[PDB]
């Protein structure tokens, strides 16, 4: 087997499984999903003595997922042949699997916009965000980007959580929240002063976009087990120290306004 040399020895048999997902959304102004996908990977970092045979089990068929591809080390499992895979891994860090889902995605945030024209020289822009996940969990690095018209002169804006700023060079209001628990909501309200323009066309509103990080896979995928068998060194599962981390991030996470 080409990807792992013989004679590897470690004082401490240990492995790390990193479940990393990007959640993508195009939502209507009224809250209809126009498109959504998760792109995901499992990265394994292992320091295991010898030539261990490993079996990776998940909560769902991997052998509600698509475009699923595996490292060259990956083989069919004997038992749980639909929810697990079996392999002798490369030493150190490698990508075990890469996948796409479209079905049953957790959309961690709902963005609810309201734009009101107050006369000809004033725009009111208001956005509510709602965290849609367990209240015991925290989202972090939250950013809401709200487009402004090209004929914006002045902006006044306040928000019920975090901080917001108008960036004239980007034609956007940028709203930052350091952390937000599941099943919470916040609001931003802006008043935008408009200058006279020769533009005859009504503002073609870019979508409102978000960045965020969440400590769960938006696909719903969960690691159930990583079993290890080293036939020659005769260590097994209880001998190996095993960790899992889930990081869900926004990809292109857009809501039309």
């Amino acid at each position: 087997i080409g990807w792992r040399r013989e004679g590897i020895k470690y004082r401490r048999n240990e492995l790390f499984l990193d479940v990393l997902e990007s959640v993508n959304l195009l939502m209507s102004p009224q809250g209809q999903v126009l498109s959504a996908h998760v792109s995901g990977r499992v990265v394994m970092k292992s320091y295991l003595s010898g030539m261990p045979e490993c079996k990776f089990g998940m909560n769902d068929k991997i052998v509600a997922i698509d475009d699923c591809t595996f490292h060259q080390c990956v083989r069919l499992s004997k038992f749980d042949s639909e929810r697990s895979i079996s392999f002798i891994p490369p030493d150190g860090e490698f990508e075990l699997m890469r996948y796409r889902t479209t079905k049953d995605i957790i959309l961690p945030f709902r963005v609810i916009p309201l734009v009101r024209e107050v006369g000809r020289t004033k725009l009111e822009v208001k956005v509510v965000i709602k965290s849609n996940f367990k209240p015991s969990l925290l989202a972090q690095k939250i950013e809401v980007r709200i487009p402004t018209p090209l004929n914006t002169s002045g902006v006044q804006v306040i928000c019920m959580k975090g901080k917001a700023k108008y960036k004239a060079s980007e034609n956007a209001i940028v709203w930052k929240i350091k952390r937000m628990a599941g099943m919470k909501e916040s609001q931003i309200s802006a008043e935008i002063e408009l200058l006279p323009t020769n533009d005859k066309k009504k503002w073609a509103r870019p979508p409102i976009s978000m960045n965020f990080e969440v400590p769960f896979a938006p696909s719903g995928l969960k690691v159930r087990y990583l079993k290890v068998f080293e036939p020659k060194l005769n260590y097994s599962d209880h001998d190996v120290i095993k960790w899992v981390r889930y990081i869900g991030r926004s990809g292109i996470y857009e809501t039309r306004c």
Partner: peptide
């Protein structure tokens, strides 16, 4: 941050 790592017991 190391608090995001969960144990896999078994």
């Amino acid at each position: 941050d190391l608090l995001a790592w969960d144990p896999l017991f078994g």
